[PDB]
């Protein structure tokens, strides 16, 4: 064939820390269907937001928003335990169906996105050029968010481990840990990946007693 229908830009959702995660790559022939399992960002999370995006940027904010919906009623559990199946299905007419289903509860929510939605030809070409001109920066952003999410998860895990230990943790140890948790919390608000990792290292250096 010399011609066929494609979806012109990548399609996906916003994940923890403002990153776009792709479900359907740009230029995929349509009709197409792809599913991916996601989970919760923190412990005891009973609801997730499914924000549908079109574009090639790593920051969710830089892509075209196609719509959003919430999935509620997830049983509060440790982070990473829920299995949230997200499906993107584009039919032959270019109509996009997005669904999210929590495997444990059976709870499901969906949205239908019209084929006329998203970016036009000129905006598509600008999107592609802007992504290539910002490839290094977008990569650094993505690496920064992965570190931030690890740091955020370390902050929560340490805090829970401290309370679970309680009296067994010596005074001098507990104070050094609380001070390093504050230094990590501050570093997480910045955009320097190595500064966050160094604060995670300093926290680990004062946390041997909890281990």
């Amino acid at each position: 064939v010399l011609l066929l229908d494609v979806t012109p830009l990548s399609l996906g959702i916003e994940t923890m820390g403002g990153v776009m995660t792709t479900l359907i790559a740009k230029n995929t022939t349509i009709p197409t269907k792809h599913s991916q399992v996601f989970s919760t960002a923190e412990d005891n999370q009973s609801a997730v937001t499914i924000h549908v995006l079109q574009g090639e940027r790593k920051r969710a904010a830089d892509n075209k928003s196609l719509g959003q919906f919430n999935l509620d009623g997830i049983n509060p559990a440790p982070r990473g335990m829920p299995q949230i199946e997200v499906t993107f299905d584009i039919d032959a007419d270019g109509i996009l169906h997005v669904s999210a289903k929590d495997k444990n509860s059976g709870k499901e929510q969906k949205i239908t996105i019209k084929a006329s939605s998203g970016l036009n030809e000129d905006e598509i070409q600008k999107m592609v050029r802007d992504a290539e001109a910002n490839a290094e920066a977008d990569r650094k952003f993505e690496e920064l968010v992965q570190t931030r999410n690890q740091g955020d998860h370390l902050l929560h895990s340490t805090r829970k481990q401290v309370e679970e230990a309680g009296d067994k943790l010596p005074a001098d140890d507990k104070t050094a840990i609380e001070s390093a948790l504050t230094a990590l919390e501050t570093a997480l608000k910045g955009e320097d990946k190595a500064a966050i990792e160094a604060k995670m290292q300093e926290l680990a250096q004062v946390s041997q007693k909890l281990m």
Partner: peptide
């Protein structure tokens, strides 16, 4: 699995 934001 990748994490999702909460409402």
């Amino acid at each position: 699995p990748r994490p999702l934001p909460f409402p």
